[PDB]
Design a binder for this molecule. Structure first.
Ligand code: PLM
Ligand code: PLM
Lengths: 57, 256, 268, 123, 178, 256, 268, 57
């Protein structure tokens, strides 16, 4: 049950991984979770504020 | 055809009309709701007063002078003695409540100033003396506001709270406080601030008396100013409304 | 991957992307193309070294203590905490609640203490490190009965090999670890105030299994923490002051920043 | 058998401390040291085994408890380590009230029991 | 009473009063002297954390002519132990009527703020207090003993669980047993 | 295969096991429910605590002696200071609650006696003096029982309550009280009585402080008796459980 | 996974879940919902750290002995037993009969004994550990002929590497190991009474294969047991007293528990 | 002949295992046998005792 994944390469290749322990708290740290969502902290207003429009109307 | 400057909020038997206000801020994008049956831990049936506890409570006002550093309120301990919210909080062991904060300050077109209203979760506060932690009679006073300071509190053998406004009492830059849900009151634009906060914790429920989930701080960044002849007494009023409050663990009254 | 720039031209319209209202507590989502003419640029830059896991996933020394093979100090004891050092503490207090597995490494190094004893001839030193959760029988001596480690986890390490290392699970009764606590331990609002209320992670002990030589040797153990699989919530502002005590957030007041010659000076 | 095991709560009785010879099958008896009450469940006796070793010894006495520090007027008492023999409680006053007296109160042994030697300050 | 079988007997009797207290102890299944030596407490002392509900079964061992009525109450922390029956009434109680059935079951539920509680003494993971009070009185006929005993049995419910393994603080040793 | 002699009742976080009891009496054949939207009058949204207010409350016991006339409790005023039921009752103006009464008295096979437990709606009580009505400090005492008398109360210039047991304090035959929901405790058969009562009134809601909907009376018809050598202290305990309680009119605390 | 709670409401029925009869020697199967009103809770808690195998599967020191490279004591001998120590013995005597494979580890550490000999220069010490089943020719000396280990299992270990370890099968003539035995070894009801009747597991020997140096060195060997694949039957109550002899269950009488101020005292 | 099994993970992932020795008394201890049956010790009465019913009738 090997996992083949993609390495970190430059822009402008695969690696293989096997788990040997039965705990799941002992596996290698996940270095590939590129996910962003700034809506929670930036732009937290209840009413949507379109950019081109006047903020106060 | 309306204007987005006016706004009304209805809760229980109370209603608040702003007339001139900025857009409402909603916590971390989350609206306060009840506890789910897949995230619960306590097995007894909770109580939900709904209308008695979830209404607008208006604390006692303070005065905005030209040299006011700022004020702070520990949110669970401010409403501890107010109405049926305080009563249920005493008898029950565990509670869980969201808030709505509505800060009001009005002035004429000739008055100038700027306040920052920030809801800070887990606002642990340092002490003037390094050896000992600050006392409760110093950290939190219900039915009144706690004021900051403009000069560093003298260290020695005491249990005071460091109150420097710039350090915010937490050893952080006051300017960097805009990480938490924050709203700005500009006397030339605004007259009120409204922040809705969900329940934040590492646990599904908690004892309100021994733990404060969030602390509301109002700080005058730009001072108050006016020309001689105009109104010199300008107060600041704070209204808090518990939302989706529920309690578990009915027993004897008191937190002893 | 960061968003690519969009080419723009001149404008004479009523749209006002620049003018906004900061009072609403809303950050503007303006791009450079709103306020000037731009060209089309394709950006291949990636935000891969900015993930919270990558930022916190690096070993850091949290403590180091020393023990001997003779005399009164024959073993070492540390109550586990990540607040003894400055660097990882400040890195971790960017957030209110965190949740991670741990990777623990130890670096043990012996050193011959000066003595008048002659004909010295040492053998390979072997060390034992033991973990006692809250409520365990703490060793009162070096030749105690508790070093049998019936259920307490223990490691035996002989000098001259790769350093020992094990993996730790979340091990928290709370749904997340708390870096800050606003409250007391007793319902009467007195006692321990602060984050010391929630620190009950146990104790660590270290000793020499043998004496090795007839001459005194002092061994130093350094403990390295590495957070893996990290989940963080509620970001907080970074410490402006300098840490004083691990137990309390007490601080000495400090200026907001450094000063410069004038408001119109481009040199610090 | 060698000299009986030393304990942190109990000490050998008068005949045993003087005795230096312990044959097989000898029973020695302990007594609570000052500031330590005796746990009724445990028996303070040790027999000499055939391997010339004493039988397993467990602490036969527990620390005594100083009386409740009480409630001071217009101030608070930390009580950091509890109220057992050898504790140390601290006193303080609120903003505007000056402490007059001692600042701490160790739990010490006064006569046949444990008492807090320092009196309560007034503030 | 620990060097006897008397440690196991709860001594109720007939008195000229109503509302007095029989016993009382805190909910610490593995640290309190009352619970640290039952089978449940002996299993707990090998584990750092615990979670779940507790069963306490009380059996009346008086005469078949004696009749009684009791209030068995659990009160979660936040206020001290109740000192009067009316204060205890406000918690989680059961009114036990001593009839043909000789046993009643007070089930202490899980009302923690966390998911798990520390076995060792910890103010943050407080458990609560368990108490008993005379609901009415023990009424006996003539030529029948008025002093009786209850017995208490401790069990865990089907939602009980324990976590980190540790060494027991009870067993000890100074030399190798030969 | 069971026996109809044992019975258990669960309400909120309280439970009552009878073991030896007669069949439960249910008011006038009606089970207590909430107020319908076709019979309501007050327009604001009611509050329904549900678990906090609807639990078994145990009043302080009394002693059944050989010459005891009897005792009475005004039901709304008995639970006025008990738990969250009393707290909500003070703050709110209107309330509406059903009850469950559980009276307990046990004795040996050699003790004899007979009590009557009657729930009397609108039990207006006369006065020893014809000119003036009885005072409140005389009509109702919370946290304790009010006792009847075996001899007529002396008339004069006072505000006492006529307490003759035979006249029941209402100028009626005590034997004819079996018109209201009633249960009999016979020491040779029973050991407890259980009566469920709905909400009875000429109005949809009412102020609990100024009006008592029902009064619970326990009267020893056949006296207590025993032979020398057996237990002489025989108490009587009363447990009340508010059912489907709801309140309208949240305002300041107190009935002033 | 533990059973989830079921939501319940009020009740006025004849069902009596609370009242039971303890005389029948039957434990009540009551849940909290029988005696109060509850909500629905989904429990994800698991009883995975409560399995008997996991509880007993941890290495524990059962014995340690010392030998020298000079003088009279040149080799060490131990008759194998798991009753020498307290911790694993008490953990194992929760049950009457057990059945497990074994994992054996040794931790050997040398130590230069003080001497007046000069120009000391040691070489790498090598140790031999040998197992002799009942009936074998026991070594009478260190340079004996039996250390050839023709059929007896033996291990050779050079100092400065990972500790030696081998796996042991059930190795019992009985269908299960007995922790308790109520009876004698002779049919005439005299002789050895107790569990010593069934202990015939053999003997263990340890020595230095070379002397290493011209200066005396004392080596200590520690033996660690780990039960794997465990099957247990007939649970028994835990030891209230303190163990005295490994061979016999003889004990000193002790109180049932600890005492408190009063039957209504919430403080130990 | 590799065995792929599931690791120990939290609620609200696979590992691979090969045996190298020919004895079966030398394999890794089984840490995943979550099976319970309290009927033998609890509720050991010959006659079933329904909960809601009176124990003695
Ligand atoms: C030889 C084996 C030793 C094993 C020692 C295990 C020690 C575990 C320590 C866990 C540290 C957890 C830190 C949590 C920090 C926080 O509260 O944010
Ligand atoms: C160098 C190789 C040495 C091999 C030594 C093998 C020793 C086997 C010991 C088996 C111990 C069995 C313990 C059984 C305990 C019980 O009776 O419950």
């Amino acid at each position: 049950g090997a996992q083949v994944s993609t390495q970190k390469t430059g822009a402008h290749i695969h690696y293989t991984n096997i788990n040997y322990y039965k705990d799941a708290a002992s596996n290698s740290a996940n270095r590939q979770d590129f996910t962003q969502d700034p809506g929670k902290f930036t732009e937290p207003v209840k009413d949507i504020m379109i950019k081109s429009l006047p903020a106060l109307n | 055809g309306y204007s987005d400057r006016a706004r009304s909020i209805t809760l229980g038997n109370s209603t608040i009309t702003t007339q001139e206000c900025a857009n409402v801020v909603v916590g971390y994008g989350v609206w306060p709701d009840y506890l789910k049956d897949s995230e619960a831990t306590a097995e007894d049936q909770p109580t939900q007063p709904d209308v008695a506890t979830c209404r607008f409570y208006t604390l006692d006002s303070v005065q905005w002078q030209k040299t006011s550093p700022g004020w702070w309120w520990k949110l669970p301990d401010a409403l501890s003695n107010l109405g049926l919210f305080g009563q249920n909080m005493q008898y029950h062991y565990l509670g869980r409540t969201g808030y709505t904060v509505h800060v009001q300050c009005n002035a004429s077109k000739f008055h100038q100033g700027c306040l920052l209203v920030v809801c800070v979760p887990e606002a642990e506060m340092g002490c003037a003396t390094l050896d000992n932690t600050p006392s409760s009679a110093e950290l939190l006073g219900g039915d009144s506001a706690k004021e900051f300071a403009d000069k560093p509190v003298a260290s020695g053998s005491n249990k005071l709270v460091q109150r420097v406004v710039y350090n915010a009492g937490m050893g952080v830059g006051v300017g960097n406080l805009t990480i938490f849900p924050h709203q700005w009151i500009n006397l030339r634009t605004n007259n009120s601030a409204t922040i809705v906060m969900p329940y934040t914790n590492s646990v599904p429920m908690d004892n309100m008396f021994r733990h404060n989930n969030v602390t509301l701080m109002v700080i005058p960044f730009v001072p108050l100013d006016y020309c001689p002849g105009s109104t010199t007494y300008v107060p600041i009023t704070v209204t808090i409304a518990p939302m989706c409050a529920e309690y578990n663990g009915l027993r004897l009254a008191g937190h002893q | 991957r960061v968003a690519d720039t969009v080419g723009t031209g001149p404008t004479n319209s009523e749209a006002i992307p620049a003018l906004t209202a900061a009072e609403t507590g809303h950050t503007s989502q303006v791009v450079p193309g709103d306020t000037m003419q731009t060209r089309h640029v394709k950006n291949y830059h990636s935000r891969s070294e900015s993930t919270i896991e990558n930022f916190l996933c690096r070993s850091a020394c949290v403590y180091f203590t020393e023990y001997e093979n003779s005399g009164a100090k024959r073993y070492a004891e540390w109550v586990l905490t990540p607040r003894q050092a400055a660097q990882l503490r400040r890195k971790l207090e960017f957030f209110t609640y965190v949740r991670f597995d741990l990777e623990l490494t130890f670096v043990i190094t012996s050193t011959q203490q000066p003595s008048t004893t002659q004909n010295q001839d040492a053998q390979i030193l072997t060390h034992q490190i033991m973990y006692v959760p809250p409520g365990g029988p703490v060793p009162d001596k070096v030749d105690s009965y508790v070093w049998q480690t019936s259920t307490n986890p223990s490691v035996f390490w002989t000098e001259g090999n790769a350093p020992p290392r094990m993996s730790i699970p979340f091990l928290s009764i709370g749904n997340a670890y708390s870096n800050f606590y606003d409250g007391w331990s007793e319902f009467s609002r007195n006692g321990v105030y602060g984050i010391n209320t929630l620190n009950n992670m146990g104790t660590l002990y270290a000793r020499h299994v043998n004496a090795g030589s007839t001459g005194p040797i002092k061994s130093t153990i350094r403990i390295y923490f590495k957070p893996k699989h990290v989940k963080a919530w509620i970001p907080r502002p970074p410490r402006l002051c300098q840490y004083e005590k691990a137990k309390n957030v007490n601080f000495q007041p400090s200026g907001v920043t450094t000063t410069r010659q004038s408001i119109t000076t481009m040199t610090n | 058998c060698e000299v009986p095991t030393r304990l942190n709560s109990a000490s050998l009785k008068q005949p045993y401390i003087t005795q230096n010879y312990f044959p097989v099958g000898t029973v020695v008896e302990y007594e609570c040291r000052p500031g330590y009450r005796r746990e009724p469940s445990l028996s303070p006796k040790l027999t000499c085994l055939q391997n010339l070793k004493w039988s397993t010894a467990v602490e036969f006495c527990k620390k005594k408890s100083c009386p409740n520090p009480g409630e001071i007027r217009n101030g608070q008492i930390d009580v950091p380590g509890g109220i057992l023999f050898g504790a140390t409680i601290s006193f303080s006053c609120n903003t505007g009230y000056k402490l007059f007296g001692s600042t701490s109160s160790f739990c010490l042994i006064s006569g046949s029991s444990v008492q807090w030697s320092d009196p309560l300050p007034e503030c | 009473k620990v060097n006897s079988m008397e440690a196991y007997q709860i001594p109720v009797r007939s008195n000229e009063g109503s509302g007095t207290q029989v016993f009382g102890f805190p909910l610490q299944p593995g640290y309190s002297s009352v619970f640290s030596r039952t089978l449940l407490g002996e299993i707990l002392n090998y584990y750092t954390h615990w979670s779940g509900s507790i069963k306490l079964t009380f059996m009346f061992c008086g005469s078949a002519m004696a009749t009684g009525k009791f209030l068995l109450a659990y009160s979660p922390p936040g206020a001290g132990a109740p000192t009067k029956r009316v204060d205890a009434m406000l918690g989680t109680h059961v009114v036990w009527d001593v009839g043909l059935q000789s046993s009643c079951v007070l089930c202490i539920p899980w009302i923690s703020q966390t998911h798990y509680r520390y076995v060792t003494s910890d103010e943050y993971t407080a458990g609560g207090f368990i108490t008993c009070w005379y609901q009415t009185n023990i009424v006996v006929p003539a030529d029948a003993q008025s002093s009786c005993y209850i017995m208490c049995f401790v069990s865990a419910c089907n939602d009980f669980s324990v976590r980190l393994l540790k060494d027991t603080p009870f067993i000890s040793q100074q030399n190798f047993f030969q």
